[PDB]
Scaffold this active site. Structure first.
Site: not given
Ligand SMILES: [N]S(=O)(=O)[C][C][C][C][C][C]C123[B@@]45[B@]67[B@]89[C@@]1%10B81%11B698B746B814B562B%10%1143
Ligand SMILES: [Zn+2]
Length: 257
Positions: A61, A91, A93, A103, A116, A195
């Site tokens: 992604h 990362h 977008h 975003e 981000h 997001t």
């Molecule tokens: N675009 S943004 O900056 O808002 C988002 C970046 C955040 C990272 C979070 C994702 C996860 B992956 B591992 B741990 C967290 B729990 B488990 B799996 B679940 B997904 B959730």
């Molecule tokens: Zn992000």
């Protein structure tokens, strides 16, 4: 599984993740006239001098530049935050063309991309516990516009050829994220969410007003990445942004007059 297409994109996410229609979803449009200056907000403290990058990963992604978050080495504090938040990854977008990709939007303006920097609240001990809390994460968001090259980005750009497809990673040590910051740390802030799925409502958003400039050539290299895995039909990794969501019962606060 979820992604950014017609059949699995943001408009579909609510079926697997019903919080997609929740009360504190991100991103949002920042209406600059409505955002209130809050003289109680502190300057942001971005302490990245000891940051230890380890690796870069194409997760299907986006790509994540990952940090060693096993001690307080790269931390965000101050601003709207209580306590200490540790950098785990950054990362971006971005769009298929320069007129979209961010975003957050600013008076409905879309930037070419958005960075981000994701941090978790040390009071919860690990990232997985932090995302279950309303004050678990702080995400520093930085807009990218196309113009002059960002010299501090080029190390990231040059490694992308080695992580073209989903599930590929590469060693990525000694990268200094200070080279991605604009001059000013003036910001907007509001309570929101991840997001991407699972869209958890655990984020204090801190969105910098001042964009960074990157070159057309730099962003073109982002657009050569692939959402697909090796040997699968090529799907360029572009337009990996969620659109603005309803603000609902939230206030966006400005750190500056
Ligand atoms: N675009 S943004 O900056 O808002 C988002 C970046 C955040 C990272 C979070 C994702 C996860 B992956 B591992 B741990 C967290 B729990 B488990 B799996 B679940 B997904 B959730
Ligand atoms: Zn992000």
């Amino acid at each position: 599984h979820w992604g950014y297409g017609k059949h699995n994109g943001p408009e579909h996410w609510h079926k697997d993740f019903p919080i997609a229609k929740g009360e504190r979803q991100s991103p949002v449009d920042i209406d600059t006239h409505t955002a209130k200056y809050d003289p109680s907000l502190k300057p942001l403290s971005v302490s990245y001098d000891q940051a230890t990058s380890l690796r870069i990963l194409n997760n299907g992604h986006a790509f994540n530049v990952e940090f060693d978050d096993s001690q307080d080495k790269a931390v965000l504090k101050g601003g709207p935050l209580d306590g200490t938040y540790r950098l785990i990854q950054f990362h971006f977008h971005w769009g298929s063309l320069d007129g979209q990709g961010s975003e957050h939007t600013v008076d409905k303006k879309k930037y070419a991309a958005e960075l981000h920097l994701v941090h978790w609240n040390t009071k919860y001990g690990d990232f997985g516990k932090a995302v279950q809390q309303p004050d678990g994460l702080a995400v520093l968001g930085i807009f990218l516009k196309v113009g002059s090259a960002k010299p501090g980005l080029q190390k990231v750009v040059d490694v992308l050829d080695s992580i073209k497809t989903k599930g590929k990673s590469a060693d990525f040590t000694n990268f200094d994220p200070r080279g991605l910051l604009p001059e000013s740390l003036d910001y907007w802030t509001y309570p929101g969410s991840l997001t991407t799925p699972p869209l958890l409502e655990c984020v204090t958003w801190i969105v910098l007003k001042e964009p960074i400039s990157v070159s057309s050539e730099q962003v073109l290299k982002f657009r050569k990445l692939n959402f697909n895995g090796e040997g699968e039909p090529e799907e360029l990794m572009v337009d990996n942004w969620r659109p603005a969501q309803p603000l609902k019962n939230r206030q966006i606060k400005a750190s500056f007059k």
